[model samples]
Target: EEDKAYWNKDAQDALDKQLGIKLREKQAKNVIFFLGDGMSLSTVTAARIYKGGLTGKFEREKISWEEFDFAALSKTYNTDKQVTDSAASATAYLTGVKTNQGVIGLDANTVRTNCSYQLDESLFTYSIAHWFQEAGRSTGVVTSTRVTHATPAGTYAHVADRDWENDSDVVHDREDPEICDDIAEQLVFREPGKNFKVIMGGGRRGFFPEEALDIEDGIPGEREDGKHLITDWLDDKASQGATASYVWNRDDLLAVDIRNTDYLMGLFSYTHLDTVLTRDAEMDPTLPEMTKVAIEMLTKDENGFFLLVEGGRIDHMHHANQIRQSLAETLDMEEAVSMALSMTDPEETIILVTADHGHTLTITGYADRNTDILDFAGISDLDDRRYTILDYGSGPGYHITEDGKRYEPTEEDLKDINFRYASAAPKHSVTHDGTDVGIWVNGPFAHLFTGVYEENYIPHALAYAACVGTGRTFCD
Candidate 1:
C-alpha cells in the first residue's frame, strides 16, 4: 500500500472521477438542508479516525459529505460576539441574517433578551422554509434536539431570547406573553410552522400545559398558560380537515399513516432527546430514523418540499466536554445524510450539509496511524503526563492536582464512554470557536457552494438553487 504505484493509481482514480463529474444546472424541485451543530473541522476529522479505528481502517474512512464534489468554508461569527452561540448562528444559516448573540429570526437590530425589539415587524427575517411554503412546497423540521431548540426554531420562531420555548419561559424572562409568542406557540400557531407537513424532535414539555403529564416518565409539562399545544395542534389540523397524527413514542411514530396523513408531530422526549449512546431503542427514534420518516412524509407532496434534518446533540455533547459522544453524534448525523441521499433523487433534490458553528475541540498528536482515537497521545514535555489526542481549547476537562500535576488517566478511564477529554483551560462548559466551518453540496447547482463565504450566505444559495426565496433564483 505504501508503494509509489499504489499511490499513483489512487490519485488517478480520483482524478478520473472528477473529470467525469457533470455539472447539474437544472432547478432543484426539492431541498434538504442537513445541519450538524458544533461540527467543527476537527470533530469531522476525529469522527473519520474513530470510524476507521472501528473497522481497522485509518484516515481513508470517509464520512458522508467527504465525497461531495463542491465544498467551501463558512465564516461563523455573530454580530455582537466573536465566538457565535447556537441561536445567533442558527439565524444566519437558516434565515440568511447574521444576528446578535442569543437572538433568532430577528435581524441585527434586536439585541439578546430584549423582548420589545422582537415585536417590531420590520426587524424579522423569513427563512427559506417560508419561501418554500410560499412557492406551494411542503416543509418539515426534524432534529435530535428539541424542535423548539435554536437550530429548528430558526425556521419558524422570532424572539430576543432562545430560551422562550414555552409560555412559562416567556414569563420567566420578564417578557409579556401577549407581546411575545413562545417558540412552541410559533411552531404550532404561526404560518410556516403551521403549514409544515412534519415536525419531530423532543421538548414535549414546552407544548403540554403544566397540569398535563407526559406519556414517557409522567413528567409534568412546563407551560404555565394552561394551553395544551399538542391538543391544539391536533385540533388545528382537524378544523382544516387535514389528516394528522401526534406521537410521543417510537412505535406510535413508526405506525403513522404517512400516505394519508397531511400533518405529523412527534415529541419523543420531555426535553432534548437522549444522546444516541444512551437512547431508549423502544421509546426514541434515532436521527436517521427520524430523517427517514420526515423525508417520507414530505415526499408525499407533489409540489416538493424543504426539510431540515439536524444532528443537534453534537453541540450539547461538546458543551459537556464529552468528545466521544460528540464524535458518535457526528457519525449519527452522517448516517442521516446517507439516508436522505438514498431516499431523494439527485436531479430533483439538492442536499447541503454544513455546520451552524465550530466547537473548541481540537485534534493534536503525532501518534501512529493505528493508535486508538480515544487513547492517550504522549507525555507532555512540561508535566511528563499523558494527554488525550482529542482535546478542547477550554472546558471542565482540565484535570490538575493540588501539586500542579496533570491527572493521569487509567486504562479503564480511557475506555469509559462518559470520559471527558483534556482541555487547555478550565471553564464550566466548552464554547464555540470563531473558525470557518465546511459546507458540502450535492445535486443541482452545487457548483455555487465552492467559495469561502459568510455563514448567512448558505440559505440564500439553497433558496437560489431551489428557485425559492426573495432572491435571484434558477427560475429567473
Candidate 2:
C-alpha cells in the first residue's frame, strides 16, 4: 500500500505538472525551429503508442516537452478549409499570414504579398534566409527531403504555385509573375551574390544540369534551359568573396573545414536522404550529424542565426501507412532534438519544434506492453484480414474497418498488442488532417505559446517577439 501510494503520488505530480498552470520567461538568443511535416496530435499519440509498445513506456513519458514551462495547441488551416497543406502552413509560420493552399509566400488572391514582402520588396521577395542575412545573422536550412520542397521553400522562397519545379508551364497565369520561377532556382539564386550560410538535403537531381548526369528514376521528364544551378551557386558565392564548399558524400562533408568556410552545401543522396532505419553509421552522416555541423558553422556569427531543420521523411512514411517506417522517422527526429539540446545553451538559443500538418493515423485499441507496434498489421494469418487496411475515407482520409475478422496471430504480433490493417491506396491515399499538433519550445519568449490558437498566430508572435517583423533590422 505504501509503494502504491508513492507511485500514485509520483504519477499525480507528473500529471499536475503537465496540466497545471505555470508562467515562465523567455530568454532566447538564437531561434531554431524544427518542423515534422504531417505530424498531428494523433500522429504523436500513435507514435507514442508505437514507441511504448517497442519499449516499455509511453512516448509522452520520454519526451522532455511535457516538463516544459508551458504547452499549447495550434490550429492549422489555409484560406479554403480547416485542413492545410505544408506550403501554406509553413508560410503562415514564416510570414505570419494565411495563404492559399498549394501556394508559397502569397495571399488568398494569389498575390505576392506578406507582412515582410511589403517592406523593401527586394529582400522580402527572396527567402527568409535573406532577412537573417541582412541582419548580419547566419541562417541555415536542413531537411531530409528536397532542399526546395514546400516546407523548406516556404521558409525561404516566394512562389505563386508549389509545383513550379522542373516545369513552369503549368503555372501559366501571366498576372502572377513569380510562378515562372521554380523552387530550386529560387533557393540557389536568392539574390545576385548573397546565399545561405548553410544548405543541406537531398534532391541533387534538381541542382544538376539536365545533361550533366544521371537523373533519379521517378523524376518527371521535363527539360529546362538554364546553367547548372549548383555550379551557378558556387560561382555566385565566389564573386562575393566567399568560398562555397560542395559535398556529395559523408567523407567529403567531414573534410570541409567548418571553421574557415561559412558557405557550405551538402547533398548526400540523389533523392531524399536515407531514412534512419536504412542509414549505415559508417557510410552516411545522420540527420543529427548534419545538424551538429550546421550549428557549429552558423553559430560563428556574433549577430546570431536562424536555422530550420525538418524531419521530412515522417510525412513520407505516414502517407504509406508504414507504421514501422514512421516510428523510425520519429526516432530520428528525437535524435536531432537531442543533438540541438546538447549543442546550444537554453538561455541564448531558443528551440521551437512543431509539425506542418497531421496525418490520418489513429491509435486505438490496446495491446500488450511488449508488442512491436511496427508488426501490428502482420499479426493476422488470414490474407483477407490484410484487405481491411485503407488509405483515405469518403472524405479526405483513409478508413480502416474497426470490426474485421481476426486471424491466427503470429509470433511477431505477440511481441506487441498489434493491429491487422494496411493502407489500400498506398500511392493516391496521401492526405492531411485538421487536428492540432504538439509545439515544444525552450528559450526566451517561450511562454507566448501556451494555448490553442490559429496557425497564422505563430509567425506573428514569433516575429513580434524576435523584433524582425518591422523590416527594421532584418527585413529592410
Candidate 3:
C-alpha cells in the first residue's frame, strides 16, 4: 500500500516534467527517426512492464524515449491490404506515400513487382532521407537486420521488391525480368540522393562479390557478378578525398575515429544480427552503442542531419514465438532512441519513436499486478493447466499432447527464455497484426503529431517539423 502511494508521487513528478517542457517553435535542425519493426501497442505496454520489473518497480524508470512531448496513434494497414508487410508499412512512413504490399518506395499507382515500369520517373517516391540530403543535410541508416532489408531499405533504397537484398534474391526470382538494382547495390553503390554518409547493419554478403572471403566463413556471398561492392564503396570514397572507414565487427566499429572519418560502413553479422537472447556482446555492438557512434559522427554537419535507426530483428524474433527476446529487442530500440535524445537539443532535434506494423503475440489472462510477463498467468479451469502469459496467433509454439497431459517447461526451458507461447490453434510461423501502433514525438511542429492518423502522416509530420519536403512548403 505504501509502495503504491510512493509511485503516485513519482507519477506526479513525471507529470511536472512533462508540463514544464515548452513547445519548440524554431525549425528543427536534426531529426532522429526510430523504427521498431512490429512494435505493436501491446508490445510496447508489455515491454514497459518488463522493463519496469527489471528495475524492481511496477512501471518504467529508465532512459525512456516513451516519455516524450506528444503521443499519437498510427493506423498501419496498407492501401490494398488490412495487414501490412514491413516493406509497405515502412514505405508509407519513410516515403510519405502509401504503396501496395511487398512494394517499397513506389506509390500505390505502381503495380507490385512490375519491373518493366521500374525506371518511370513519376513512380518513384523519395524518402525523408532524400529530402534531408537534398536540403544539404547529412543522412544515414542503421538497423539490426540486413542493411538491405525492408525497414532499413525504406530510408533510401527505392526498389520494386523488398526481397531483392543480395544480387542473388534478384537472380533467383523468375519474375524479376530485368536484374534491376538490388537493395545492397543501392546502398553504397547508388542511392536516392548521395550515398548515405554512414551505413551500418548486417548483410555483409550482399555487398561482397564471389571473390571476397565470406567473413562468416561457411556462408559465401550470393552476388553472381563479381562486383566486390564493399571494396568499390571504399574506392569511391577515397577518390573523393573523404576519410572513409569500413568496420565488420564491434572492435573495428569502436576504433573508427569519428573525428577524422567522413564516411562509414559497418556490417556486423553474416545474416541478421544475433537475437538479443543469444548475443555475444564482445563480437557485436548493441543498438544503443551503434546509435551513439552514428549520432556523434553525423552531428558534425553544420546543416544538421537525419538518421533512421531500425530495430529490425524485433519482428523476426516475434515471428518465431520468442516472446522475451522480441520484447528485449523492442526495449533495446528504446535505449537507442534515448541515446539520441541525450546527444541533441530537444529544441532543435525532432525525435520520434514509432513502429512500422504490429506483431501477433499478446499478454494473456490477468494474473496479478506483479506477474512476470513471461511466466504462467492464471490456472485454466478445463484441465487446471498452467498457461504462459504470452500467446501468438499461429506459430511454432503449440505442441502435440503426449496422450493428453500437463508437464510443460523442460529443465532446459526453465530460464527466462521466450518459452514459445502456444498458438492455442495451428500451423506455420506467426503473422503480423492489423492493429494500430503508436507514435511518440517531441520538438518543433510536434503538436500536429498528436491526433490518430494514417501511417503516411509520420513522414509528413517529420518533414514539417524540420521544415523539409513538399509537406512543409505550405507551412509559414
Best by lDDT: 1
Top TM-score model: 1
Stronger candidate by lDDT (2 vs 3): 3
For every model shown, what is its TM-score relative to the native structure?
A: 0.98, 0.81, 0.94
Which model is ahead, 1 or 3, in terms of lDDT?
1
Residue ranges of candidate 3 with Cα displaced over 4 Å: 2-18, 60-63, 175-179, 216-218, 402-418, 473-476
Which candidate would rank higher by TM-score, 1 or 2?
A: 1
RMSD of each: 1.0, 5.6, 2.2
Q: For candidate 3, write residues 1-476 as lDDT tens digits.
A: 65988989988998899788777777888989999998888888888888877877854444386677688999999988999999998889999888898888888876776664456768888899988887888998888998889998898777778888877777777544244888877776666534688888888888776666677455767787787888888999999989898888898899899899999988898778888878899989899889989998899998889999998888887787778898889888988887888889887888888899988877887778777677778777887767777777767777767886753655356355656767755556678889898888887767768789999888887887787887654245
lDDT of 1 by residue, 1-476 (tens): 66899999999999999999999999998999999999999889999998888777778888888888999999998899988988999899989999998999999999788898888989998998999999999999999888999999999889899999888998988888887899999998897888999999999989888788998789999988888888899999999998999998898988988789899999899999999888989988888899999999999888899999999999988887898899889998999999999999999999999999988898888788888788888878987777788888978888888887788876887777787787888888888888999999999999999899999999898888899988999898
Q: What overall lDDT goes with each candidate model?
A: 0.90, 0.66, 0.82
Descending-TM-score candidate ranking: 1, 3, 2
Residue-level lDDT for 127 in candidate 3:
92
Clashing pairs in 3: none
Flag the better candidate by lDDT, 1 or 2: 1
